[PDB]
Write a protein that binds this ligand. Structure first.
Ligand SMILES: [Cu+2]
Length: 153
């Protein structure tokens, strides 16, 4: 798993969240092109805890083209809490400690926001067509809704 966390100030966080390359329709972020960039954050201000925001939407379904290289940037913007971002074929409902192996791509637990900074990380995924879920593994978070769906096809 990706366990390499970089620091970003708020302006840097904002700059990165604006780099998401999907187009929203309804509650679905649709990506297109050979290389796509998903930028996800764990609980942006104004959004409910615990949740992931992608392209200013709460736990949206991500529609990605089969064959695409997916560059994911995961930013933990939630002061006081660690969060993870792990892609899996296992769907909800999630146990308090989610039983989601195999994790096809994802992160370990992030650090908590410190000294006016936020931890973030980037990983690359080369999905095979199918339905997947992006879920947080911090105990209880997925059970209380911190997950979304990914449809690769
Ligand atoms: Cu979490």
């Amino acid at each position: 798993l990706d366990t390499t966390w970089k620091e970003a100030t708020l302006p840097q966080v904002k700059a990165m969240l604006e780099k998401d390359t999907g187009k929203v329709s309804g509650d679905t972020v649709t990506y297109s092109g050979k290389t796509v960039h998903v930028v996800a954050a764990a609980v942006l201000p104004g959004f409910p805890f615990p949740s992931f925001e992608v392209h200013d939407k709460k736990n949206p379904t991500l529609e990605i083209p089969a064959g695409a290289t997916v560059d994911v940037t995961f930013i933990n913007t939630n002061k006081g809490f660690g969060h993870s971002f792990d892609i899996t074929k296992k769907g909800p409902p999630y146990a308090v400690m989610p039983v989601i192996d195999p994790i096809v791509a994802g992160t370990g637990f992030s650090p908590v926001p410190k000294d006016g900074k936020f931890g973030y990380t980037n990983f690359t995924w080369h999905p095979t067509a199918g339905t997947y879920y992006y879920v947080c593994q911090i105990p209880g978070h997925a059970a209380t809704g911190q997950f979304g769906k990914i449809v690769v096809k």
